[PDB]
Ligand binder design. Structure first.
Ligand SMILES: O=P(O)(O)O[C@H]1[C@H](OP(=O)(O)O)[C@@H](OP(=O)(O)O)[C@H](OP(=O)(O)O)[C@@H](OP(=O)(O)O)[C@H]1OP(=O)(O)O
Lengths: 262, 47, 24, 386, 423, 73, 32, 643
């Protein structure tokens, strides 16, 4: 996820300068540090790349690392590009952080004589998209996840089913007994500009790269609730290929993994 | 008090050939009656 | 076949029942 | 047994068919005022008044009031018709006396037998305008010294199940009976129309049920039964497409209307304007149970040349196929109306051309034509004399 | 750049639950069907989106957005609305009498005024072109020519008797009910749907003066009495009573309504309307001319009336109803087809409406009849003229709000003023 | 042939029946119609005489039988 | 196969989206 | 009325009662109760401001003249109920007061009638103002003038209003400046017409038109005069259409100008039909005179042959041109409408083919039929005198051919019997060649004195048919000399057994009299009578229950019939129940003619039937008839009158 977005120990050091898991040992100013690769036996061994020199004032095989960072409004866009001439392989990573489509609609209050904007902003307001390129003719690893709250997605679909679809639906379907009650439960009536369903803290991350696997996505549901033990993210992961259930309890950057691989 | 100063503050802070009392045109005249009166008015125009 | 095509066209014009109330 | 499949194919692809609709009393149409004829207004009124009644069954004031106004106009109109009939009756009594009016006889054309020799039997007192209409049936070859009128044709039309002249089902029955010492020719035909929806309250969907039975005793010891069910919806694939579908089932039942050979067919019709060409096409396929027949017709009109008329017809039977093309044009010249029809049959490679000319004055055609025809006849007779 | 919805309208629509009850559902369905047929614009995303949508012009919405940025038991509702719509639809468009009044002024009056005065698709279609096409349509039955001489296929298999065909010609047919009892189906007085007035020919008829019924009564066109006047209903009944009391026998008199014999009126049958038969053989047309004009004018008027109804419903009625509910909470004539018409702008609708109002004003203020007798009677007897300052006050408020692009709040300011007038 | 000799007696005995039974009746019925038509016109003349109006212009005898052919009535 | 190729096209759309966000930052977000 | 019943009660603004005040009663306006009926607002029904507003604008135009102003108010019966009462108060337009009414200039109006007018007005009070009475007076005089039939007499103007007397001047218009024009209607298919005008032409004829119109200056116009004027002018018979229109002079109120426009007929008329059948191996067939032959008919006709409206038509159909002799067909028809006072003359050449009842299955199971085809010229005069009396004199020359289905000619008739056919029996034609050319005369005399009294016939009908074949003798026409004569007499008389009944004392009840019908017929033939002219006994007509020719053939025949008809309309059931007994005899016609047709087909020669039947709408009748000799009965249906 976001940890995977920037696993480089050198790019992480570059970010610090601009300001089972082991942090990168990087010291920078106006830089470079060492590749402190994370290791999950009795001890652990890090890697070592001599050419870790990175210089972006304008922001083995030699490398050219240029980072482009532009953030407009609620949308944030980072691009990390590395270019090795001898390898002829380029690693580019672009992430997007935008709320995306909104069910909410601008309203006019006659008494105020002014437009009331849905100024309220979803907390996530992020639709992470992950896509790295190996650098060969056909090497790419995309791990985009539905960062947008599942509740934010459900509201957009429920609003669509209500205003646009219901009118099209025929009446002979409504003739079915007990169907309208279930429909009413499924689709609540909008109150003010507020959401019909107040679901928050639930996220959906899917990992599936065409090069990595033909058809093996890892489904990861994440619950981020402050009330549970004073906060803590409980992520459940189902890897079809490894038959592994990854129950996790990560709080304040803690690393946990109840591997259930079969 | 948001005084509006009484009045004046309520608003903005070939092709085809009134003695009567009406309050507001929101109540319109029956279309059939309108067609009849127009037809007669053309006859009067002819006469 | 011409027979099959004519039968299919008849099935298509049978969409009048779908356009009206259907499966009362 | 069942007639050649060619008969059934031709009957199916008659052309674009428009079904029958409702009929309006007209007393309540304007609530007692002069009205014009519109199909939409009539249909809307039948559904509207039925809907207002339906609502007025519940306690809706505006509905109750609108229905009440219709009843007052309906009662006024009916009483006025009753009074008019009562009056016209007395006036007719004074005009003709106690003697009843006598109708005119039936013309039969020139005969060597004295003119109007039997005219007395064809003149009768006029009936009191009953529902049925009686038409005499005649034969091509009559008896040497008698009238050729055998049997009668009876036609009845109505619209039952209408509450106050609003709604109901358009109906029609036609029976021909020719009982004789040796003959029993009963031929019948019935039509019923069901209207599902109307343009203001939704689409215009209409369904027609037709049932025809033919029985002749001295020739066939069996009865031919036929049914047809058609459904037409305006604008299936367009704004005003007028497309329609239909099914036909004919059985020659032994009487046993069960055990008989059965012919089943399906038809569809569609109209479509594409560019400057307006097209009206109807196709149909019938199978007997087995013989399979295909038939379609297509009328095409061209905007730039309105006068030209183009009809195309194709029949395939199984193997065997055949089509024909007909073109028509009309004009005027020499103070006379001319019409030229050109028919081409590909199966026989024959072209027919037919011109009809009508003149109202000057006999110009006699001078400009028919001179060779007289010459050849004269030569023939003269050659015989030689 | 975005759709702006009314907060008040959205709250009212959200408050109700159309799918709560079956009767509510069916009433909701009815309105949904009728609205979709007329109210809903073809270029409208949804009925639900439009009802709430607060229709604001581009300039007005931009100004409102700029002004904002700068500063910083209702179940029955649908049923009522449905009844209101259908009742309005009857009077506004589907009224036979209203259409009849429109066609008489549209065609007959313009005629009298004229008489007293005297590969590319084709879009300039003309009446003459329509007649030329009509000639082709009248020959459709002969054109089929099925099986050569066989022609029409509508024949019983056993014999040759013809069978009724519900073909395209059925469209030019009108039938009217008159008198499972009674209400017999009959052809309408004017059978042709495309009604057309006759020419000035064959108006005169030959008459035979004859003794009718009781003696002393002679009828050439009307029954007349010995005094020389026309008979009266009471006189007719008195005459019948006298005959019932005087006449004792029947035979010794000539027979009225005597048996008819053929060859009667030979000249009349052969020569009557000879020119009419020849003219038909020349024109080769059905429904004559200008019947299509009458029908087309009816259709065009119905189209304009439906456009006006849509504008009225979505601009005047519904806001006012919702506000009260919320308080509760030269060229030749061109033949044109209907397929090639689009709704007109509101300005054009006002432009024709003012002309209609001008004609109405001419009829009320200046009736000629009234003027003719003015010196002797009813000069200009009282003549009432009523001042309308209150009507001007409502109009003056509308002008101010319209100039301020405050038309959105117009429905509220006018409602308050009207209440204040009643208060 | 006795029947052939009898044939002249027959054609005559039927001419006699025509000439002494049919033609007088035809004349009598036509006379009754003629007198009635004059009476109807006289009654119309009487009615016109009241109110002091000019008598109706009636067709000449040559025109009545010709009109009998053309009567819309 | 064809869905995977559609996914590659979707990835190009995500790159375009990113470019649009960067362009918005360059001019529209240059203001704030 | 349940819908408008007071039983409905609501908490909404529902009208409880309607009050009309200030309604003019002296005027001809519909009674206030009738006006209440016209109002949109109804008792027991809800209303809105729009209702009242529409009613005010409606009532106003409806009247306007008598009523100056309408005021509608809605007082609340009670505040809490919301139930309201609608009061309509009308201010009648009244201008000045008249105490007297006088009429002047109405010369033709009798003095007595005028006196009752002022008495009829009976003004309630000689005060305030009265405008309604003036309209009532105007209507009376005009009504009288119209009922007399003069439509050009009207009240010119009212006067004396200032003096307080309703003086009126009645204008009586008179005819002057009668004129005539001639118009020729051009013929073209344009759905519109252009008329060539020749008013100057036939100026002498126009003077004759004025003479035949009978329009005199200084005589008051009357419509009945124009109907008489139309009858006299039309008698010319040569005019397609005559239009006469009186127009009031614009300047003079007492002058009427009568305009006449007459259009003549156009006799010329030719219709030509053509056909072609071109066959091309490639492209088009090479142009040839043979390929260009139409083979089409020509129908020249003229409608004014001799100026007496004589009509003639010639039709000539050749199947193939360049060879017309093959299947040439010629027809001619001539008629003269005004040949004699009551006689119409005709001469037509026509072809008629019919079956022969002379040869029919009798004792023999099945017999092939014969079709008599007669192509002949008939010239005849028809005369209608009195009422329903017919005299027809026909002289006809016809060639009678006998055809058996496809077979061109049949020498004689045959019965299949056992084996194939049988030896020569009845000779179908005297010539023995199967064909015969005959010249003959026929006379038909019909005396009818039957009247339909309440839908039942009563009276006497006599029919007399006589035909003589004047056929010359060796090397002469083969028709033969023969005389055939038949006579029929039918009497419908009131059932003597029952009382007289009828409408004599039941004129009002319109009861139909019970009737007995007696019928007799006799027919004798002497001479060379051919088989096609043999009298055939049996059929739906004559003796019922037997098919055509079943009874047999008789040179001398006698038919007797009686029938009791009782109309069921008096009983209140539609239809007439008739019981009939019909008899027919051969009068000893055994060995009637060569071949003994009756013996050859084993026909009985004599007959008796009795039947019970019901009449229906029009002439349709359904009966059950039982033959005496056969012992069997069969239901039969037929259209027409048996007698
Ligand atoms: O636009 P077109 O293709 O020429 O069709 C029109 C159209 O009929 P359709 O909608 O069925 O195609 C007219 O009706 P509207 O569209 O105006 O409602 C109709 O006129 P009527 O409805 O009055 O019959 C007219 O037919 P016509 O000219 O005979 O009146 C007919 O044109 P076509 O006859 O050429 O198809």
């Amino acid at each position: 996820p976001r940890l995977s977005f920037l696993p480089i120990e050198w790019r992480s050091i570059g970010s610090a300068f601009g300001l089972q898991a082991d942090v990168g040992a990087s010291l920078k100013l106006n830089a470079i540090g060492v590749s402190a690769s994370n290791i999950t036996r009795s001890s652990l061994i890090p890697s070592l790349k001599l050419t870790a020199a990175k210089q972006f004032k304008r922001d083995q095989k030699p490398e050219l690392s240029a980072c482009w960072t532009g953030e407009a409004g609620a949308d944030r866009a980072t691009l990390l590009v590395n270019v090795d001439p001898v390898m002829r392989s380029v690693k580019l990573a672009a992430a997007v952080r935008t709320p995306g489509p909104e069910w909410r609609k601008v309203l006019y209050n006659d008494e105020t004589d002014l437009l009331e904007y849905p100024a309220d902003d979803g907390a996530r307001h992020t639709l992470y998209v992950q896509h790295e390129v190996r650098g060969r003719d056909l090497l790419h690893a995309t791990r985009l996840g539905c960062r947008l709250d599942l509740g934010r997605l459900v509201n957009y679909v429920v609003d669509f089913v209500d205003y646009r679809i219901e009118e099209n639906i025929p009446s002979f379907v409504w003739n079915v007994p007990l169907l309208p009650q279930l429909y009413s439960l499924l689709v609540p009536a909008d109150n003010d500009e507020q959401v019909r369903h107040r679901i928050t803290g639930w996220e959906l991350d899917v990992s599936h790269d065409f090069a990595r696997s033909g058809l093996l996505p890892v489904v990861a549901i994440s619950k981020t609730s402050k009330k549970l033990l004073g906060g803590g993210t409980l992520t459940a992961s189902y890897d079809a290929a490894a038959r592994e259930a990854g129950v996790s309890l990560s709080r304040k950057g803690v690393s946990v993994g109840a591997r259930v691989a079969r | 008090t948001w005084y509006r100063g009484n009045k004046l503050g309520d608003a903005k802070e070939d092709s085809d050939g009134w003695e009567g009392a009406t309050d507001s045109e929101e109540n319109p005249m029956d279309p059939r009656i309108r067609e009849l009166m127009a037809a007669e008015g053309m006859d009067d125009k002819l006469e | 076949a011409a027979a099959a095509f004519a039968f299919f066209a008849g099935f298509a014009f049978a969409a009048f029942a779908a356009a009206a109330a259907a499966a009362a | 047994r069942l007639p050649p499949m060619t008969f059934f194919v031709e009957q199916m692809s008659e052309g674009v068919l428009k079904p029958e609709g409702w009929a309006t009393m007209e007393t309540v149409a304007g609530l007692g005022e002069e009205v014009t004829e519109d199909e939409g207004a009539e249909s809307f009124n039948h559904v509207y008044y039925r809907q207002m009644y339906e609502l007025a069954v519940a306690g809706d004031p505006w509905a109750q009031r609108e229905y009440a106004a219709m009843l007052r106009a309906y009662d006024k109109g009916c009483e006025s018709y009753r009074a008019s009939y009562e009056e016209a009756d007395v006036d007719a009594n004074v005009e003709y006396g106690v003697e009843s009016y006598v109708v005119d006889p039936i013309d039969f054309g020139p005969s060597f037998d004295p003119e109007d020799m039997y005219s007395h039997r064809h003149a009768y007192a006029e009936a009191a305008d009953a529902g049925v209409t009686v038409i005499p049936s005649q034969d091509y070859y009559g008896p040497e010294h008698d009238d050729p009128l055998n049997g009668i044709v009876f036609q009845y039309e109505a619209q039952p199940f209408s509450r106050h002249g609003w709604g109901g089902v358009p109906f029609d029955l036609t029976v021909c009976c020719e009982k004789d010492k040796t003959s029993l020719c009963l031929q019948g035909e019935t039509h019923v129309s069901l209207v599902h929806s109307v343009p203001p309250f939704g689409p215009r969907h209409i369904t027609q049920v037709t049932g025809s039975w033919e029985v002749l005793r001295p020739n066939i010891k069996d009865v031919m039964y036929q049914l047809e069910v058609d459904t037409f919806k305006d604008g299936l694939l367009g704004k005003s497409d007028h497309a329609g579908c239909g099914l036909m089932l004919a059985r020659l039942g032994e009487g046993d209307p069960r055990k008989g050979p059965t012919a089943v067919g399906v038809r569809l019709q569609d109209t479509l304007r594409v560019g400057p060409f307006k097209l009206e096409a109807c196709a149909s396929k019938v199978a007997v149970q087995k013989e399979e027949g295909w038939g379609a017709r297509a009328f095409v009109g061209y905007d730039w040349l309105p006068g030209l008329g183009m009809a195309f017809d194709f029949i395939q039977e199984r193997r065997l196929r055949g089509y024909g093309a007909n073109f028509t044009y009309d004009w005027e010249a020499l103070g006379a109306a001319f019409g030229m029809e050109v028919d081409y049959v590909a199966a026989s490679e024959s072209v027919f051309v037919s011109v009809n000319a009508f003149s109202g004055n000057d006999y110009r055609l006699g001078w400009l034509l028919l001179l060779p025809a007289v010459n050849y006849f004269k030569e023939t007779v003269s050659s015989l004399w030689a | 750049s975005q759709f702006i919805y009314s907060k008040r309208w959205k709250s009212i629509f959200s408050k109700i639950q159309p799918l709560q009850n079956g009767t509510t559902r069916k009433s909701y369905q009815l309105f949904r069907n009728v609205a979709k047929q007329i109210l809903v614009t073809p270029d409208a995303k949804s009925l639900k989106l439009i009802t709430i949508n607060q229709k604001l012009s581009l300039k007005e919405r931009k100004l409102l957005e700029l002004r904002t940025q700068y500063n910083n038991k209702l179940n029955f509702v649908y049923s009522e609305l449905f009844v209101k719509l259908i009742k309005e639809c009857k009077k506004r468009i589907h009224d036979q009498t209203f259409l009849k009044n429109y066609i008489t002024h549209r065609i007959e009056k313009r005629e009298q005024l004229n008489q007293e005065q005297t590969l590319r698709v084709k879009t300039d279609k003309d009446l003459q072109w329509w007649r030329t096409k009509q000639r082709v349509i009248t020959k459709r039955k002969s054109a089929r020519k099925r099986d050569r001489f066989k022609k029409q296929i509508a024949v019983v298999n056993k014999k040759l008797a013809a069978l009724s065909k519900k073909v395209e010609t059925e469209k030019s047919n009108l039938y009217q009910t008159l008198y499972a009892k009674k209400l017999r189906k009959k052809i309408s007085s004017k059978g042709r749907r495309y009604r057309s007035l006759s020419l000035a020919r064959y108006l005169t008829a030959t008459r035979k003066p004859r003794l009718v019924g009781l003696d002393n009564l002679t009828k050439i066109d009307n029954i007349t009495t010995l005094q020389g006047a026309f008979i009266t209903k009471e006189e007719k009944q008195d005459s019948l009573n006298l005959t019932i009391q005087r006449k004792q026998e029947l035979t010794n008199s000539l027979k009225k309504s005597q048996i008819k014999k053929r060859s009667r009126h030979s000249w009349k049958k052969r020569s009557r309307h000879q020119f009419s038969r020849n003219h038909y053989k020349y024109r080769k047309r059905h429904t004559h001319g200008n019947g299509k004009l009458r029908v087309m004018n009816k259709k065009l008027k119905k189209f304009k009336a439906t456009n006006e109804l849509r504008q009225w419903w979505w601009n005047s009625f519904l806001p006012r109803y919702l506000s009260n509910l919320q308080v509760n909470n030269k060229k030749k004539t061109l033949i044109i087809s209907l397929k090639n018409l689009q709704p007109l702008k509101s300005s054009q609708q006002k432009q024709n409406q003012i002309k209609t109002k001008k004609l109405v004003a001419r009829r009320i203020k200046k009736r000629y009849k009234l003027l003719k007798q003015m010196p002797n009677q009813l000069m200009y007897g009282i003549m009432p003229r009523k001042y309308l300052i209150e009507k001007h006050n409502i109009k003056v408020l509308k002008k101010k709000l319209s100039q301020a692009y405050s038309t959105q709040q117009l429905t509220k300011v006018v409602q308050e003023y009207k209440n204040l007038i009643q208060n | 042939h006795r029947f052939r000799w009898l044939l002249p007696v027959a054609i005559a005995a039927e001419v006699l029946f025509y000439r002494r039974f049919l033609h007088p009746r035809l004349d009598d019925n036509q006379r009754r119609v003629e007198r009635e038509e004059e009476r109807v016109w006289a009654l119309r003349g009487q009615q016109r005489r009241a109110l002091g109006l000019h008598r109706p212009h009636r067709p000449d005898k040559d025109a009545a039988w010709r009109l009998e052919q053309m009567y819309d009535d | 196969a064809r869905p995977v190729l559609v996914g590659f096209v979707l990835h190009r759309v995500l790159k375009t989206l990113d470019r649009s966000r960067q362009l918005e930052y360059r001019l529209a977000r240059m203001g704030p | 009325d349940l819908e408008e019943k007071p039983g409905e009660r609501s908490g909404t603004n529902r009208c409880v009662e309607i009050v009309i005040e200030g309604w003019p009663d002296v005027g001809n306006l519909p009674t206030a109760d009738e006006l209440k009926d016209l109002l949109t607002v109804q008792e027991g029904h809800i209303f809105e401001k729009q209702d009242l507003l529409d009613d005010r604008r409606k009532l106003e135009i409806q009247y306007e003249d008598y009523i100056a102003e309408v005021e509608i108010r809605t007082e609340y019966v009670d505040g809490k109920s919301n139930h309201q009462r609608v009061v309509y108060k009308f201010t009648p337009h009244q201008f000045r007061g008249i105490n007297a009414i006088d009429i002047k200039g109405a010369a033709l109006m009798p003095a007595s009638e005028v006196e009752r007018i002022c008495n009829e007005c009976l003004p309630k009070q000689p005060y305030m103002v009265d405008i309604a009475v003036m309209d009532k007076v105007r209507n009376r005089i005009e009504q009288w003038y119209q009922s007399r039939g003069l439509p050009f007499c009207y009240v010119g103007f009212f006067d004396g209003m200032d003096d307080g007397i309703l003086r009126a001047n009645v204008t009586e218009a008179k005819i002057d400046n009668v004129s005539v024009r001639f118009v020729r209607p051009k013929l073209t298919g344009d759905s519109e017409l252009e008329y060539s005008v020749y008013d100057e032409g036939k100026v002498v004829k126009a003077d004759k038109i004025i003479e035949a119109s009978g329009f005199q200056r200084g005589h008051h116009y009357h419509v009945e005069d124009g109907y008489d004027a139309m009858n006299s002018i039309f008698a010319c018979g040569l005019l397609e259409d005559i239009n006469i229109e009186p127009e009031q002079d614009p300047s003079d109120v007492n002058k009427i100008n009568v305009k006449i426009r007459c259009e003549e007929v156009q006799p010329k008329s030719m219709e030509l039909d053509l056909d072609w059948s071109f066959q091309l191996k490639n492209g088009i067939p090479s142009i040839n005179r043979q390929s260009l032959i139409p083979g089409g008919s020509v129908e020249v006709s003229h409608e004014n042959l001799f100026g007496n409206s004589e009509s003639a038509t010639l039709s000539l159909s050749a199947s193939d041109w360049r060879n017309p002799s093959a299947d040439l067909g010629f027809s001619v028809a001539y008629s003269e409408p005004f040949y004699k006072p009551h006689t119409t003359r005709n001469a037509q050449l026509f072809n008629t083919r019919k079956t022969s009842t002379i040869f029919t299955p009798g004792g023999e199971s099945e017999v092939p039929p014969v079709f008599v085809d007669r192509f002949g010229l008939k010239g005849w005069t028809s005369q209608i005198t009195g009422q329903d009396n017919k005299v027809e004199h026909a002289l006809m020359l016809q060639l009678v051919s006998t055809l058996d289905e496809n077979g061109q000619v049949v020498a004689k008739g045959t019965k299949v019997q056992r084996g194939y056919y049988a030896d020569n029996g009845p000779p179908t034609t005297n010539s023995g060649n199967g064909r015969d050319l005959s010249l003959s005369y026929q006379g038909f005399f019909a005396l009818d004195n039957v009247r339909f009294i309440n839908g039942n016939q009563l009276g006497e009908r006599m029919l007399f048919q006589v035909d003589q074949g004047l056929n010359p003798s060796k090397l002469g026409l083969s028709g033969g000399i023969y005389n055939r004569a038949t006579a029929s007499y039918t009497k419908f008389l009131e059932a003597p057994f029952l009382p007289k009944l009828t409408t004599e004392q039941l004129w009002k009840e319109r009861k139909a009299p019970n009737t007995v019908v007696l019928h007799a017929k006799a027919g004798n033939a002497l001479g060379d009578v051919a088989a096609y002219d043999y009298f055939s006994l049996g059929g739906p007509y004559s003796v019922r229950g037997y098919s055509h020719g079943e009874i047999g053939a008789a040179r001398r025949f006698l038919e007797l019939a009686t029938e009791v008809r009782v109309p069921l309309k008096n009983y209140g059931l539609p239809g007439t129940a008739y019981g009939f007994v019909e008899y027919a005899t051969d009068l000893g016609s055994g060995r009637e003619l060569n071949g003994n047709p009756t013996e050859y087909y084993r026909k009985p020669g004599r007959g008796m039937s009795y039947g019970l039947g019901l009449k229906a709408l029009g002439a349709c009748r359904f009966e059950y008839a039982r033959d005496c000799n056969a012992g069997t009965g069969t239901f039969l249906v037929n259209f027409g009158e048996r007698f």
